Amino acid sequence: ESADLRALAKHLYDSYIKSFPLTKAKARAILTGKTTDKSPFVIYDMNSLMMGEDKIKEVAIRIFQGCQFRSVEAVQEITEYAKSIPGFVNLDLNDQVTLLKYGVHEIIYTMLASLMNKDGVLISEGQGFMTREFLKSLRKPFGDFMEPKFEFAVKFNALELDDSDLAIFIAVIILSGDRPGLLNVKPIEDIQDNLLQALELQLKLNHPESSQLFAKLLQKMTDLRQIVTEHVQLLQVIKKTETDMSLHPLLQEIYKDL
Numbered sequence: 001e002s003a004d005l006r007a008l009a010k011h012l013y014d015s016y017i018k019s020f021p022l023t024k025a026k027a028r029a030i031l032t033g034k035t036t037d038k039s040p041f042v043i044y045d046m047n048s049l050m051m052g053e054d055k056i057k058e059v060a061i062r063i064f065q066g067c068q069f070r071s072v073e074a075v076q077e078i079t080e081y082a083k084s085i086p087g088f089v090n091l092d093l094n095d096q097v098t099l100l101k102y103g104v105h106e107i108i109y110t111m112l113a114s115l116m117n118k119d120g121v122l123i124s125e126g127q128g129f130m131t132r133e134f135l136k137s138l139r140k141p142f143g144d145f146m147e148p149k150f151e152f153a154v155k156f157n158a159l160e161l162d163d164s165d166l167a168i169f170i171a172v173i174i175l176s177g178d179r180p181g182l183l184n185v186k187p188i189e190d191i192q193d194n195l196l197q198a199l200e201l202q203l204k205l206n207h208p209e210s211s212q213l214f215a216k217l218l219q220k221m222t223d224l225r226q227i228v229t230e231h232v233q234l235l236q237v238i239k240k241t242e243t244d245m246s247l248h249p250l251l252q253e254i255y256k257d258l
């Protein structure tokens with residue numbers, strides 16, 4: 001029944017709105033700065049950055065740190081959201097932990113696109129905008145870890161998905177089952193199967209003209225994996241070049257064996 005599938009889509013959208021403070025809707029509205037309710041401060045260089053901490057509540061390491069803090073925060077919102085997916089909290093605890101361990105970063109890069117445009121990314125809850133060119137000019141290793149995200153953001157944003165779409169797609173990512181170390185696959189697959197039906201319908205109804213958008217969206221998932229991997233090894237390099245520093249424990253525990 002299409003009706004049960006719509007009920008599920010609305011449930012997921014609602015929970016998404018409540019779990020994530022900054023939606024794509026608000027983000028795109030800020031990025032298209034014609035809506036002057038509140039425009040962002042733009043950081044494009046050193047002085048921009050220092051003037052940044054001014055109104056916005058070495059450089060490279062500070063940014064690196066910032067991403068980690070935002071990351072840790074996002075893991076907590078995604079975790080809150082995951083709990084709202086029917087059946088998720090009823091799975092064996094070990095698997096709930098596993099699906100989160102592998103889902104979190106694919107979702108973080110997915111939602112990150114929502115705050116990006118070809119030239120930059122919204123930081124500090126939309127109050128700031130950091131350009132792509134500034135991030136790419138960062139010192140030796142810290143100067144290229146963001147580019148892959150932007151390239152993905154550009155292609156991914158072309159699908160023109162909105163928050164209601166994303167909310168179900170996000171749920172499909174978490175209830176994979178192909179994740180390494182799962183004890184009970186079937187209960188996870190039955191759920192994802194149902195989530196897939198809801199996402200298919202949702203795209204069909206919300207994007208009548210977008211031919212095979214469902215297929216195109218699913219393909220984007222192979223892109224996320226490569227982004228995660230690529231980022232993990234760039235992280236390994238940093239941990240070695242900077243011994244006086246360390247990756248936040250949560251991120252560290254998420255990366256232990258992947």
Ligand SMILES: CCO[C@@H](Cc1ccc(OCCc2ccc(OS(C)(=O)=O)cc2)cc1)C(=O)O
Pocket residue numbers: 062063064065066067068070071108112121122123124130231235251
């Ligand atoms: C290096 C840490 O990377 C995170 C993933 C990540 C990457 C980028 C990201 O957001 C990019 C936009 C951004 C840029 C600077 C920033 O810091 S600041 C101090 O300027 O607010 C915060 C977010 C969020 C999570 C991980 O491995 O878990």
